[PDB]
Design a protein around this ligand. Structure first.
Ligand SMILES: *[C@@H]1O[C@H](CO)[C@@H](O)[C@H](O)[C@H]1NC(C)=O
Lengths: 49, 49, 49, 49
């Protein structure tokens, strides 16, 4: 049974055990947002997505 | 109207609010290829390789 | 202008794989075992040096 | 959840070429693709990059 994946930015799909944590703002924190891993401060954004 | 797509390189200009306002097709004409090379929509006077 | 261009190149090289699986170290470390992670990190380190 | 996968019978050949046999559960994948077939014992070595 050959499993084929494509781990590019991990947009959305098999996401594995998913323990979550309440969002934090204005703090230098480690974030794992839907497979996107980084560290930084998180602010409310006026960018129109 | 029906047209057929092709593998092309495009230079897309995103405006302040996040939407595409203009594009340049690199293979259309020499000026467009110069625009793609300089990554600008305005080309100054001169000779560009 | 020259200075700007130089710095820009130095940033664009951070998005180059240099033969590694990905250009993001966190992706490599969160997706491969340390033995193969060493090879990928070595390629990235050589390129960036 | 890969608990059932690991709880199935011991595997003659379990090679992961790109991800870590053990870290497949902290990563989020994009499309996932499963291919199932039956081949002879010596033809398993042919199913490899
Ligand atoms: C972008 O959106 C802003 C927000 O209202 C608007 O004022 C502006 O005109 C838009 N850009 C263009 C090129 O129209």
């Amino acid at each position: 049974v050959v499993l084929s994946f494509e781990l590019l930015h991990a947009p959305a799909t098999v996401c594995g055990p998913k323990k979550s944590t309440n969002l934090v703002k204005n703090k230098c924190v480690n974030f794992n947002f839907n497979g996107l891993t980084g560290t930084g401060v998180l602010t409310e954004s006026n960018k129109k997505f | 109207y029906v047209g057929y797509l092709q593998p092309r390189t495009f230079l897309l200009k995103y405006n302040e609010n996040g939407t595409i306002t203009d594009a340049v097709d690199c293979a259309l004409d020499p000026l467009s290829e110069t625009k793609c090379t300089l990554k600008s929509f305005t080309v100054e006077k001169g000779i560009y390789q | 202008n020259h200075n700007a261009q130089a710095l820009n190149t130095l940033v664009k090289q951070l998005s180059s794989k240099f033969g590694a699986i990905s250009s993001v170290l966190n992706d490599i470390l969160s997706r491969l075992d340390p033995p193969e992670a060493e090879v990928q990190i070595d390629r990235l380190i050589t390129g960036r040096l | 959840d890969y608990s059932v996968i690991y709880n199935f019978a011991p595997f003659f050949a379990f090679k992961c070429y790109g991800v870590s046999p053990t870290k497949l559960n902290d990563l989020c994948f994009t499309n996932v693709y499963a291919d199932s077939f039956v081949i002879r014992g010596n033809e398993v070595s042919q199913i490899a990059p």
